[PDB]
Amino acid sequence: KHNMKAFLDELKAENIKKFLYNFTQIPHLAGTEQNFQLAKQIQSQWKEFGLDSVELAHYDVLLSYPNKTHPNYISIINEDGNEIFNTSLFEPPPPGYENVSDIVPPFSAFSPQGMPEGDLVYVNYARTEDFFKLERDMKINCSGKIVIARYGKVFRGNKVKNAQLAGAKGVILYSDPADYFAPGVKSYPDGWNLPGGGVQRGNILNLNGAGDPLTPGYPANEYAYRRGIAEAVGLPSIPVHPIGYYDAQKLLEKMGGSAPPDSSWRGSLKVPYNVGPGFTGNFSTQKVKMHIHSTNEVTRIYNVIGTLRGAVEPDRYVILGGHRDSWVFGGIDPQSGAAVVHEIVRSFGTLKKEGWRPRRTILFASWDAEEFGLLGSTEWAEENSRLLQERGVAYINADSSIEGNYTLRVDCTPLMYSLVHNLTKELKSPDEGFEGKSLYESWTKKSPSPEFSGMPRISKLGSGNDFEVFFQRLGIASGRARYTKNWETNKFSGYPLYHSVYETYELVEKFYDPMFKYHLTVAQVRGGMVFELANSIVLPFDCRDYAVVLRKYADKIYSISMKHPQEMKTYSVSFDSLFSAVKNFTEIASKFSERLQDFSNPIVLRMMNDQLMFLERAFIDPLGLPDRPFYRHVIYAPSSHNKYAGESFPGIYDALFDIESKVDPSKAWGEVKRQIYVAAFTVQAAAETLSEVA
Amino acid sequence: KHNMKAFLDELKAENIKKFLYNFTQIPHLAGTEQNFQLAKQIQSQWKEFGLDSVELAHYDVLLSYPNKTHPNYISIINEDGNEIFNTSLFEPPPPGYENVSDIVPPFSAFSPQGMPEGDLVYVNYARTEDFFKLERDMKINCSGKIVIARYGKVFRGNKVKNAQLAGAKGVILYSDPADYFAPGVKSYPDGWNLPGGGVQRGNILNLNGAGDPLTPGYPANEYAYRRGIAEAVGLPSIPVHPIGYYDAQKLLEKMGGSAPPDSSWRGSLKVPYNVGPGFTGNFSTQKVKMHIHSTNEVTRIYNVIGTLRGAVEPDRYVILGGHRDSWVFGGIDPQSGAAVVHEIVRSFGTLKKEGWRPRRTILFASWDAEEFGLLGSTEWAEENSRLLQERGVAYINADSSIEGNYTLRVDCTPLMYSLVHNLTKELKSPDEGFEGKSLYESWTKKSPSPEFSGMPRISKLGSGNDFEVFFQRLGIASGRARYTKNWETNKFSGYPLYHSVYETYELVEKFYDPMFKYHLTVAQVRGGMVFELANSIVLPFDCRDYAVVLRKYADKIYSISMKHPQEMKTYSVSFDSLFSAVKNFTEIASKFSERLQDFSNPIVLRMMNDQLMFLERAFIDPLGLPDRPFYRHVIYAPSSHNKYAGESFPGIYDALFDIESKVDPSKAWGEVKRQIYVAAFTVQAAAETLSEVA
Ligand SMILES: *[C@@H]1O[C@H](CO)[C@@H](O[C@@H]2O[C@H](CO)[C@@H](O[C@@H]3O[C@H](CO[C@H]4O[C@H](CO)[C@@H](O)[C@H](O)[C@@H]4O)[C@@H](O)[C@H](O[C@H]4O[C@H](CO)[C@@H](O)[C@H](O)[C@@H]4O)[C@@H]3O)[C@H](O)[C@H]2NC(C)=O)[C@H](O)[C@H]1NC(C)=O
Ligand SMILES: *[C@@H]1O[C@H](CO)[C@@H](O[C@@H]2O[C@H](CO)[C@@H](O[C@@H]3O[C@H](CO[C@H]4O[C@H](CO)[C@@H](O)[C@H](O)[C@@H]4O)[C@@H](O)[C@H](O[C@H]4O[C@H](CO)[C@@H](O)[C@H](O)[C@@H]4O)[C@@H]3O)[C@H](O)[C@H]2NC(C)=O)[C@H](O)[C@H]1NC(C)=O
Ligand SMILES: *[C@@H]1O[C@H](CO[C@@H]2O[C@@H](C)[C@@H](O)[C@@H](O)[C@@H]2O)[C@@H](O[C@@H]2O[C@H](CO)[C@@H](O[C@@H]3O[C@H](CO)[C@@H](O)[C@H](O)[C@@H]3O)[C@H](O)[C@H]2NC(C)=O)[C@H](O)[C@H]1NC(C)=O
Ligand SMILES: *[C@@H]1O[C@H](CO[C@@H]2O[C@@H](C)[C@@H](O)[C@@H](O)[C@@H]2O)[C@@H](O[C@@H]2O[C@H](CO)[C@@H](O[C@@H]3O[C@H](CO)[C@@H](O)[C@H](O)[C@@H]3O)[C@H](O)[C@H]2NC(C)=O)[C@H](O)[C@H]1NC(C)=O
Ligand SMILES: COC(=O)CCN1CCCc2cc(-c3ccc(/C=C(\C#N)C(=O)NCCCC[C@H](NC(=O)N[C@@H](CCC(=O)O)C(=O)O)C(=O)O)s3)ccc21
Ligand SMILES: COC(=O)CCN1CCCc2cc(-c3ccc(/C=C(\C#N)C(=O)NCCCC[C@H](NC(=O)N[C@@H](CCC(=O)O)C(=O)O)C(=O)O)s3)ccc21
Ligand SMILES: *[C@@H]1O[C@H](CO)[C@@H](O[C@@H]2O[C@H](CO)[C@@H](O[C@@H]3O[C@H](CO)[C@@H](O)[C@H](O)[C@@H]3O)[C@H](O)[C@H]2NC(C)=O)[C@H](O)[C@H]1NC(C)=O
Ligand SMILES: *[C@@H]1O[C@H](CO)[C@@H](O[C@@H]2O[C@H](CO)[C@@H](O[C@@H]3O[C@H](CO)[C@@H](O)[C@H](O)[C@@H]3O)[C@H](O)[C@H]2NC(C)=O)[C@H](O)[C@H]1NC(C)=O
Ligand SMILES: *[C@@H]1O[C@H](CO)[C@@H](O[C@@H]2O[C@H](CO)[C@@H](O[C@@H]3O[C@H](CO)[C@@H](O)[C@H](O)[C@@H]3O)[C@H](O)[C@H]2NC(C)=O)[C@H](O)[C@H]1NC(C)=O
Ligand SMILES: *[C@@H]1O[C@H](CO)[C@@H](O[C@@H]2O[C@H](CO)[C@@H](O[C@@H]3O[C@H](CO)[C@@H](O)[C@H](O)[C@@H]3O)[C@H](O)[C@H]2NC(C)=O)[C@H](O)[C@H]1NC(C)=O
Ligand SMILES: *[C@@H]1O[C@H](CO)[C@@H](O[C@@H]2O[C@H](CO)[C@@H](O)[C@H](O)[C@H]2NC(C)=O)[C@H](O)[C@H]1NC(C)=O
Ligand SMILES: *[C@@H]1O[C@H](CO)[C@@H](O[C@@H]2O[C@H](CO)[C@@H](O)[C@H](O)[C@H]2NC(C)=O)[C@H](O)[C@H]1NC(C)=O
Ligand SMILES: *[C@@H]1O[C@H](CO)[C@@H](O)[C@H](O)[C@H]1NC(C)=O
Ligand SMILES: *[C@@H]1O[C@H](CO)[C@@H](O)[C@H](O)[C@H]1NC(C)=O
Ligand SMILES: *[C@@H]1O[C@H](CO)[C@@H](O)[C@H](O)[C@H]1NC(C)=O
Ligand SMILES: *[C@@H]1O[C@H](CO)[C@@H](O)[C@H](O)[C@H]1NC(C)=O
Ligand SMILES: [Ca+2]
Ligand SMILES: [Ca+2]
Ligand SMILES: [Cl-]
Ligand SMILES: [Cl-]
Ligand code: NA
Ligand code: NA
Ligand code: NA
Ligand code: NA
Ligand SMILES: [Zn+2]
Ligand SMILES: [Zn+2]
Ligand SMILES: [Zn+2]
Ligand SMILES: [Zn+2]
């Protein structure tokens, strides 16, 4: 029989391992010839595997590269202008890769050029609250200072935006062992920790969903009109560069001025973590100087798009997508994901060769330039936005399959919760101690839901990956899944070797997943979701699960506002309309679910499959959120303080944030009330898409 | 049999006449008790007629009314401040209505209050080109002047916006006999001409699609957050008032300063039409003073929404809508339309009582507050926008059924051209001399297409009526049809008694349509279109007709740009991408049409009906046109110089308009190129919705 079990049994750990090895021998930086060569290889293999069509979709987008003959670095300079300390020009390459060429040195993509010199201020993680603490409580002024911030806790683009708004003239990012060195594990190559010469690459844009900085709204095709650089979306205005902790120690050790305000500001290095500004007495005349010479350049990128045409509803698309470009070798990010997609394609293609087709069309995507701002997925969705919003059933992302070896991690729309619970109950746990038990059982035991006993934790989608255009701009039901760590060590930093030259095939094979069993489990979860989405007669979405979370989010946002009881009285701020809408959604969703159970009529079916498919769509507001026109989903947006985190009822959340500091409270509370109305209206409108249609 | 012929034969001229009489005995001003009473009557009768559900949908919107105890008027004042001439306080009521109460006196809805005094400037029709002529050629400065403009040629809101941007401190509108008195016909009540005491009411907003000025984007429901008045959409900033030609003659006769620049500036009154400023020598110390005391007030309005549930595709909506509110009695506008809708509902309901249902759902709408800015249709579409954009097949408007008795007028999307040709070939001409001939034949003979022999003229949709939200904001295929005049007399002014107290039942019964045969023909055209849209197995849209017009519009816009060959060379302005997209659309549309002919499979059918339904939808750009976020259709928008007229490729048109006067040509031509890219991209994206789906 050709059923989900046939699909799942065809997936092989050994194949994933072979593909990962194949994808990680050389760097595949976006816009480079090697990444175009890999794109062509994937296109050819997906054709071989049996897909109906496999095309490259190319765009010309703004990318950023260091200057090969004018290297980026940072110095401590003395009063004569002699550079007495220089940060490294490259990470020491790992064993056996010391002759690999075209390893891009560490840099912050899209940094402007410049050579600013000044006194250092240490700003902890450079979060909104770190700058609050500096300016409001400690009275330290960052204006015209170079700030030094540790990576972790929030997306590095938000750190840079925060530093810029504080008046910094430059930003130095570094990896503190507190955040990137797990106690009792060795540094690469003898364990999975970050060595002191290791450095995390990454872009520092604030795109807010825009895609290519030069063509917001429209695909960067051959005849596109581009903005000039001065009007580009999301570029930083001050130079930025990342360093490892050997070099950071040299920059931090001489720091003077004020003490750290508390122990939450101290990392693990043998330094005081003084905030500054500037160095202690002996060295007070020394300064820090950055030298940044990277250039932004419009460069061609290539997505591979594979199609497996649906037998019954070819005009309904279930999308499995993940990126292919990497900073260096991409051992985890993204090739551990891409190897998993390759094996999924292979398995579906085996079934297709035996005569099977899925009910709905499955689209497979190998995205380019994800690392430079989700550019390949966003440009392709801008090109195809009309097809996607009228036909897009679901998008399953497929970046890194592992960031640990402890348990499953799922972030998705509430519409997929029941699908994920059901599927994981049918899959075998790969975990030691759970032999013969379901993935659901092991996952639930290791990662319990905070709300419900006997259920596992499933998080809201945030951002910083290729589902952003599909979910928060276009309103297509989206999900992601990977193996993860126990979050009770170095929390809200990912894995230590993230975006470093040390993220290699050997990292994975030796330290994360030697048997490729976690990879296989992740292929079963991602592939299984795609299979059910593309093949179930009734779409496997439960609208009642949206009703339950909407109430939780409404309680949360109400609780935030209720910290200001006097202002809620003065300005007549009521949440009644939002609770009413959520109550109505709950009642209508319950009734819709009864009809979905209680209806041989393919029009009623497809009518109801359309109501299911368009339910995520109904949370889109075509006017977008304030000053973020590409974040249109009213229930979920990336946190305005951390692109990685999701925020619920983001319009109301941002209206309430730090509201006690606004100069005009009547105007600020007016805007809170405006966002309440928008959210209540959108919830009610979404509910009404589930009512009887006539 | 229950087929279109059964539907059409059930329609009766005598019923339309009875309904028109019933709807026009008292005024039905939006927001008044009498208009709520009529709404309740229509709701009750549509239920009686057999519709499945009939609901009122109410909103609280900004309306505008004169102050009953502080009347609006204009004076000529002398140097002592004695008011030596006053304009009328009311139109002399027609025979037999001299005791009807609650006739709203003439006023310009949404005028601010004020009592400005100053010298008059006569500005012809107050068009963009009239102000160009004044400022650029004649060197007359309107700053701080009261302008007097004749009605006609363009929507009165554009006149006011143009006067405001010229620095006027007030606007006086009047009806010139040149534009509102047809040679050789008598004034009401003895003919259909405007008497000298007659005055045209009408709002002077510039909403650009926004709907209620206080709630752009969202329905004005019970919990809506409203903008303050200062941030409202579209309100004029200077007082405005309309007068008849007896009073205008008194204001114009003393005008001095410069002569009219040419005869296109002279109307029919026995006055010089001097432009001013101010009066001739003897009277140079006299001034004009306005007294405006109207108030804007949030007021409840009521739409009636009737549903006839579809038998096979209940989740597909074909909408017949027209408004019910009137300025006074609404003898033509809108009750000649509403009586026609009432009879259509009656006929469909007769068939329903015999057991028939249409294939798709038909929604019937009696809109409120159309006269105050399309408010009722727009608020309802804002409320239901998600249902309408995923389910809306078509919208047929149904305002005034007659504006003349000469021939048919149709303005619609190209997607309806073939439907209209086919239907009119099956209908009988009501015209004298065409007994036994088709409506198509009489219409084609009297109103030939300018492009094609043996075809009738069908115009682009403009605006100034309730289809605006459905077509230009939401991208639902839309059309309108009515009987019209021969446009070779007083051109681009409508009918003489438009928006006057004289627009009565007797006007229609005595002078326009004594046998109600033109009304019946219009009921057959509107009703027949609805019938085919709601009942044809394959949607009756021909995508090839869009391809033909796209080429015509691309040639037109290219020809405008080619007036500036030097700048097109300097700035590398090419239309190649737009022509390529139009060529592709033509090829893909031809192939789609072959498949539509060449496919028992209801999924392929409905898949292809979805491609047809979503084709108009594909011309929407969710970012809207520049500074007009609610005009989202890239092919059609209301002219930025005249809301009544449609403009094709409006983004490029506005970028090219008066471009030779821009101070920064590189920036201006850059924006032309940007709009070319947007238009070429949107045409190609629309074409690709017609490609094979996978
Ligand atoms: C959750 O779902 C419920 C439906 O079960 C919605 O309930 C509606 O709530 C609104 C209030 O926001 C009600 O609005 C009121 O309507 C009255 C007229 O209603 C009649 O006509 C409608 C046709 O639209 C019928 O549906 C209805 O059954 C009645 O026949 C108005 O008279 C009310 O206005 C008066 O009172 C208010 C409040 O004091 C004053 O401000 C006004 O000035 C005026 O005096 C009022 O507008 C509506 O009737 C309810 N519908 C139903 C079917 O019960 C909730 O709105 C929904 N939640 C959200 C967030 O949408
Ligand atoms: C009307 O419809 C036609 C399709 O019939 C479209 O034609 C496309 O036109 C674009 C130009 O805008 C072509 O783009 C060119 O693609 C080359 C690579 O194409 C290969 O890969 C694609 C996969 O996407 C295949 O479809 C294709 O068959 C080929 O296998 C590039 O190499 C070209 O770039 C080079 O030349 C340009 C121009 O000189 C330089 O600026 C570049 O720097 C570079 O050197 C170029 O990008 C595209 O190939 C065409 N497709 C097909 C199938 O023919 C029209 O675009 C469409 N009109 C509109 C408005 O959309
Ligand atoms: C830190 O690095 C700086 C800069 O060095 C340069 O850039 C780096 C990224 C590497 O690619 C280096 O190889 C590269 O040189 C060092 O300061 C520089 O020192 C050099 C050599 O001593 C100076 O060159 C001199 O140039 C003048 C020309 O007028 C001659 O008089 C001299 O004979 C000599 O050739 C150079 O001027 C100087 N540059 C700057 C910007 O200060 C620095 O020594 C190094 N510090 C360390 C390792 O502690
Ligand atoms: C044009 O109309 C103005 C204003 O008249 C008023 O408003 C109109 C819309 C109508 O509703 C009128 O019925 C209404 O009166 C006329 O000017 C006004 O004339 C009256 C009567 O002569 C003046 O009243 C005077 O008030 C003072 C109070 O201090 C006394 O000294 C007088 O005994 C007398 O009662 C009024 O002040 C004056 N108003 C203004 C604003 O000028 C005007 O006569 C008329 N012109 C015509 C018909 O040619
Ligand atoms: C209900 O739910 C809840 O309770 C919500 C809970 N909740 C609410 C409150 C606190 C909170 C915090 C977080 C996080 C904070 C830090 C996080 C992780 C990192 C940091 N700093 C990090 O760098 N990880 C590396 C892998 C991830 C990026 C990685 N992606 C990329 O590398 N992409 C590129 C390009 C991206 C782009 O340009 O946009 C890049 O980032 O450079 C991946 O996705 O694997 S996640 C998440 C949820 C959360
Ligand atoms: C291919 O095509 C082509 O060739 C396109 C050709 N083409 C291109 C170039 C020249 C041109 C000019 C025109 C016109 C110019 C003036 C016109 C008519 C009037 C004036 N002035 C007028 O007042 N008519 C009264 C009835 C119409 C309004 C009447 N509507 C209302 O009364 N509505 C209210 C509220 C509206 C709102 O608030 O928005 C109001 O207007 O007050 C109706 O629709 O019956 S139409 C049309 C097309 C055209
Ligand atoms: C990753 O795996 C791919 C797919 O197996 C490898 O690419 C493939 O490499 C082989 C051997 O080089 C190619 O076959 C050769 O073809 C040429 C003619 O073009 C011929 O001269 C040789 O004799 C040989 O038959 C094959 O085309 C190619 N397939 C692709 C790109 O689809 C790739 O080498 C692996 N990469 C690494 C780093 O291991
Ligand atoms: C995840 O799995 C659960 C458990 O199987 C699914 O819920 C179950 O769905 C079935 C099929 O629709 C329900 O069966 C129905 O039962 C009623 C009788 O009460 C009958 O009227 C229907 O004809 C039908 O037989 C079943 O009740 C229901 N079980 C529970 C506990 O809710 C669920 O649908 C799955 N989720 C997804 C997204 O697939
Ligand atoms: C326009 O036509 C409508 C519909 O025919 C007229 O309204 C209807 O008027 C009649 C007579 O007044 C109403 O019947 C009456 O009902 C009351 C009880 O409510 C009773 O006291 C009387 O004896 C009589 O039976 C009828 O309800 C009403 N129908 C509606 C509103 O649906 C209306 O009068 C006409 N208007 C004009 C201006 O001619
Ligand atoms: C308006 O009326 C015209 C004329 O009736 C309609 O065009 C006609 O549509 C029919 C039905 O699809 C076409 O018949 C087809 O003919 C081909 C053979 O060439 C065959 O392959 C198909 O199975 C089918 O029998 C017919 O060719 C076509 N006539 C013309 C002159 O184009 C048109 O569809 C109507 N428009 C609307 C919107 O309904
Ligand atoms: C990368 O840096 C080098 C310099 O280290 C740049 O080459 C110089 O560019 C300047 C300014 O245009 C010229 O005046 C010199 O003649 C060049 N010098 C040398 C030594 O080649 C180069 O332009 C930069 N590359 C990029 C892509 O920006
Ligand atoms: C319409 O106009 C009348 C005046 O002709 C207004 O009534 C006056 O309002 C003023 C200012 O608020 C009061 O001081 C007076 O006591 C009122 N005078 C009279 C004679 O009644 C009235 O407010 C206006 N109506 C509206 C709805 O604006
Ligand atoms: C910080 O320093 C700058 C530059 O000297 C100054 O202009 C600014 O006002 C200061 N801000 C605060 C909050 O002290
Ligand atoms: C793999 O699992 C073991 C057992 O818990 C753990 O000690 C080790 O740290 C894990 N490896 C990684 C990379 O997390
Ligand atoms: C018109 O008059 C005003 C007011 O006196 C003046 O400020 C303005 O500059 C003048 N404009 C032109 C174009 O002459
Ligand atoms: C009705 O038609 C006749 C015949 O052409 C014409 O003379 C008369 O003016 C028409 N009435 C109206 C209101 O146009
Ligand atoms: Ca873009
Ligand atoms: Ca509104
Ligand atoms: Cl992922
Ligand atoms: Cl109409
Ligand atoms: Na384990
Ligand atoms: Na290695
Ligand atoms: Na005639
Ligand atoms: Na009359
Ligand atoms: Zn990644
Ligand atoms: Zn990454
Ligand atoms: Zn009207
Ligand atoms: Zn009107």
DSSP string, B70-135: S--EEEEE-TT--EEEE--SSPPPPTT-TT----PPS-EETPPPB--EE-EEE-TT--HHHHHIII
User: Which amino acid is located at B283 in the chain?
Assistant: F
Name the token pair of B160. Answer: 């006011």
Chain B residues whose CB is inside 8 A of the A621 CB are 217
Q: What is the CA radius of gyration of chain B?
A: 25
Report which of A543, A540, A537 is spatially closest to residue A606, judged by C-alpha positions. Answer: A537
How determined? X-ray
Give B552's contacts (C-beta < 8 A, 6+ positions apart). Answer: B451
Report how far residue B496's alpha carbon sits from residue B477's, in angstroms, rounded to the nearest whole number: 31
Report CB contact under 8 Å: B386, A689: yes
E-strand spans in A195-292?
202-203, 240-243, 287-291
CB B54 within 8 A of CB B365: no
CB A241 within 8 A of CB A288: no
Resolution in A: 1.7
Name the token pair of A396. Answer: 């399953």
User: Quick count: other Cβ atoms within 10 Å of Cβ A184?
Assistant: 7
For ligand 3, pick from A68, A78, A86, A250 the residue to mutate: most ligand atoms within 8 Å of CB. Answer: A86
Among B312, B383, B678, beta carbon nearest to A218: B678
CB B64 within 8 A of CB B294: yes
Does the beta carbon of A645 sit less than 6 angstroms from any atom of ligand 5?
A: yes
In the numeric block, the tokens 């969710």 are attached to: B622
Residue A629 is part of a domain; what is its CATH number? Answer: 1.20.930.40
CB of B603 within 8 Å of a chain A CB? The answer is yes
- Size of chain A in residues: 694
DSSP A537-601: SS-S--HHHHHHHHHHHHHHHHHHHTT-HHHHHHTT---HHHHHHHHHHHHHHHHHHHHHHH---
Report which of A618, A473, A483, A465 is spatially closest to residue A541, judged by C-alpha positions. Answer: A618
Q: Which residue of B has its CA nearest to A307?
A: B694
Q: Which residue of A has its CA nearest to B578?
A: A223
Strand order in the sheet with B240-243: B120-122, B146-150, B170-174, B240-243
A280 by Cβ neighbours in 10 Å (0-12 / 13-18 / 19+) ranks as middle
Phi, psi of A64 (to 5 degrees): -145, 135
Phi, psi of A363 (to 5 degrees): -110, 135
Does the beta carbon of A582 sit less than 6 angstroms from any atom of ligand 1?
A: no
CB of A576 within 8 Å of a chain B CB? The answer is yes
Report how far residue A551's alpha carbon sits from residue A557's, in angstroms, rounded to the nearest whole number: 10
User: Quick count: other Cβ atoms within 10 Å of Cβ A257?
Assistant: 18
CB of B307 within 8 Å of a chain A CB? The answer is yes
Does the beta carbon of A480 sit less than 6 angstroms from any atom of ligand 5?
A: no
**How many Å lie between the centroid of ligand 17 and the Cα of residue A478?**
21
**Breaks in chain A listed by the residue before each, with C–N > 2.5 Å:** 599
A266 by Cβ neighbours in 10 Å (0-12 / 13-18 / 19+) ranks as middle
Domain span at residue A596 reads: 543-689
Q: Which residues of A are catalytic?
A: 370, 574, 610, 633
Q: What is the SS3 assignment for A366? A: strand
B541 by Cβ neighbours in 10 Å (0-12 / 13-18 / 19+) ranks as buried
The three-state DSSP-derived secondary structure of B239-263 is CEEEECHHHHHHHHCCECEECCCCH
Does the beta carbon of B422 sit less than 6 angstroms from any atom of ligand 10?
A: yes
Instruction: For chain B, report the end-to-end CA distance as a whole number of angstroms.
Output: 40
CB B467 within 8 A of CB B643: no
Report CB contact under 8 Å: B386, A221: no
Instruction: For chain A, report the end-to-end CA distance as a whole number of angstroms.
Output: 40
DSSP type of residue A235: -
Strand order in the sheet with B392-397: B53-65, B295-308, B360-367, B313-323, B392-397, B477-484, B407-412
CB B650 within 8 A of CB B636: yes
